[PDB]
Structure 1
């Protein structure tokens, strides 16, 4: 009944790491009640692809459906930039809607990662802010995390990728740790994951000796 499709690219984390599988999603919006199940066929460069299960007729509080179709997309295909259309092949609908999705085209650029210690004014406050400047990467598909002593840190917020003057992107990651951990020799490292990096991974540490 004249639906709307929302595209969803895979997470760069899931794309660039092996422990989490990547998925590509085409969320349908406001489909008719006479067709509660929407048949979804994944057209990988026009080639029909099997499996790729879908969420079975999930319904909002309003009289509408939020049918979600996912596909276990391999990492190498998304790295090489395979276009996925998600053609709607429902039984009784109007003309099909094609919405291709793929990796961001263009020459990949290796990000330059810089760890910035907190300002001296931040040492007045209880919690200091640790800054990871990731700049120079052209594809915005990046994953920036933090870790200390080999274990992940979850008290971080990362800005969205901001387009630079060079045509590349930059962002910042702010890890908020309390002053007690920072004033002792605790090593905090931001680990970014980008397709243009060597081994799709790099790490920059920050352990209060940066700038000494």
Structure 2
């Protein structure tokens, strides 16, 4: 059997009202040795409050069993290490995977808005650009708003590693030219552990 261990979603870690979870997944579990025992550790100390999910096997030969551990906000953000230890009779010894937040001094993103280029103005639809740079770790969420409303015609690049070891990305919002024209305000919001209140916002409007 094989073990994979997944982190929580960026927003879940940053918002006190949401529930950050770590997920331990076991695949390739045999019918002859189907029994699968999970032990979880938080910086080496065993915890007993994981919620094991029912096994679901479509469609190939084995089965994957997933155990979900809720993590404390402060613990994840302080870099504690979550260990999933999986025991099964088909293994030589128990398998152990360990996950945490990336290690090192957090760095605050700088956020800049850029308007469409002149050449793009000749088009029917235009692109509003949000540059987010200098952040560490790479865990981040970006969204767009207009008129106190979520704008959803955006796509965001994955984080890219910069030369100093920090990260950058860009988010592009697509809007009708005529709408950009007439001076509506559009906003780029960023959630990241190093921002004050884990949140900042920048705005962009026709000049």
More strand by share: 2
Structure 2 contact 183–206 (Cα < 8 Å) conserved: no
Aligned residues: 207
Structure 2 contact 20–70 (Cα < 8 Å) conserved: yes
Q: Which one of the candidate residues 195, 199, 211 is aligned to 2:206?
A: 211
Against the structure 1 CA distance between its residues 118 and 98, is the aligned structure 2 distance closer, same or farther, given a 3 Å change threshold? same
Task: Show CA shifts across 1:116-174 (max 9, x none).
Answer: 11112222222211111000012101111111122222221111111111221101111
Mapped partners of 2:85, 2:150: distance in 1: 39
Q: Where do 5+ consecutive residues of structure 2 fail to align?
A: none
Structure 1 contact 140–161 (Cα < 8 Å) conserved: yes
Corresponding residue number in structure 1 for 2:143: 145
Task: Show CA shifts across 1:48-83 (max 9, x none).
Answer: 212221221111211221222211112111111110
Mapped partners of 2:32, 2:49: distance in 1: 25
What TM-score results when the alignment is normalised by the length of structure 2? Answer: 0.92
Structure 1 contact 60–66 (Cα < 8 Å) conserved: no
Q: Which one of the candidate residues 12, 15, 18 is aligned to 1:14?
A: 12
Q: Where do 5+ consecutive residues of structure 1 fail to align?
A: none
Against the structure 1 CA distance between its residues 67 and 124, is the aligned structure 2 distance closer, same or farther, given a 3 Å change threshold? farther
Q: Provide the secondary structure at the position in 2 that maps to 1:67.
A: strand
Mapped partners of 2:199, 2:100: distance in 1: 21
Task: Show CA shifts across 1:33-55 (max 9, x none).
Answer: 23445222211111121222122
Mapped partners of 2:206, 2:49: distance in 1: 53
Q: Provide the secondary structure at the position in 2 that maps to 1:121.
A: helix
Larger deviation: 96-105 or 176-185? 176-185
Larger deviation: 67-76 or 195-204? 67-76
Q: Provide the secondary structure at the position in 2 that maps to 1:99.
A: strand
What TM-score results when the alignment is normalised by the length of structure 1? Answer: 0.90
